[PDB]
């Protein structure tokens, strides 16, 4: 079976058959894919739709298939990053823990295998303002993981800080706390110049004092 075949199958109106279609595609990926670039794009497009699904089995299966496409395409997946990242930001807001986790894992995989971490972050940073509080928390958690896996050298820290500053004021404690963890982890990697930066961000004084208390407690 071929790409023409899978392109048609993943676009079926009958969603009920997505798991069966997906399993076949997964086996196929594991085993031309790139003989028609248009068809490859339409297939990835459709699977990005599957990631959207409220059925966790389908969203997970879409994530697995996209992950397999990343394994086989590497930097040739770059053209799909924009739309995949939008879907991933939404998915990080999913009610189901495993789904949120697999969404985050794929985002990190893009930074490892498809394009430099900052290229991904230029798109991913849009998620900081998403109107799902779980998505907002997830973007912060991605930043922490990015530092844990790739370090701070690949990123332009000054473009990420202002987003965290907004999230210090979030309506949810879990989002504020994740943003705080993220800024403190930036501090761990970059050092005292992060304090210098944070004085120029318009942060209210009592909040800034609180952030610097967290910095003082960085290893205590």
Numbering used by the authors: 5 to 35, 41 to 229
Please, what does the article write about this entry?
Cytoplasmic linker-associated proteins (CLASPs) are excellent candidates to promote MT growth because they are well known to increase MT abundance and stability in mitosis and interphase. CLASP1α and 2α consist of three TOG-like domains (termed TOG1, 2, and 3) and a C-terminal domain responsible for interactions with CLIP-170 and other partners, CLIP-interacting domain (CLIP-ID) (Akhmanova et al., 2001, Al-Bassam and Chang, 2011). Mammalian CLASPs encompass three TOG-like domains, TOG1, TOG2, and TOG3, none of which bind to free tubulin. CLASPs suppress catastrophes by stabilizing growing microtubule ends, including incomplete ones, preventing their depolymerization and promoting their recovery into complete tubes.
To understand why TOG1 does not bind to free tubulin, we solved its structure by X-ray crystallography. The structure of TOG1 showed a conserved TOG-domain fold, but also demonstrated that the conserved residues required for tubulin interaction are lacking. This explains why TOG1 does not bind to either free tubulin or MTs. We also checked whether TOG1 could bind to alternative tubulin structures, such as tubulin rings induced by dolastatin or vinblastine, but found this not to be the case. We confirmed that the binding of TOG2 and TOG3 to stabilized MTs was weak, while TOG1 and CLIP-ID did not bind to MTs at all, and none of these domains interacted with free tubulin. Strikingly, the deletion of this domain (which converted CLASP2α to the equivalent of the naturally occurring splice isoform CLASP2γ), strongly diminished the ability of CLASP2 to suppress catastrophes, in agreement with a previous publication (Yu et al., 2016). To explain these results, we hypothesized that CLIP-ID has an auto-inhibitory activity that can be relieved by TOG1. Addition of this construct potently increased the anti-catastrophe activity of all TOG2-containing CLASP2 constructs that lacked TOG1 but contained CLIP-ID. These results suggest that CLIP-ID, when it is not bound to partners such as CLIP-170, has an inhibitory effect on TOG2, and possibly also on TOG3, while TOG1 can relieve this inhibition. Thus, in contrast to a previous publication suggesting that the ability of TOG1 to bind free tubulin is required for CLASP activity (Yu et al., 2016), we establish that TOG1 has an autoregulatory function. TOG1 is present in CLASP1/2α but absent in CLASP2β and CLASP2γ isoforms (Akhmanova et al., 2001).
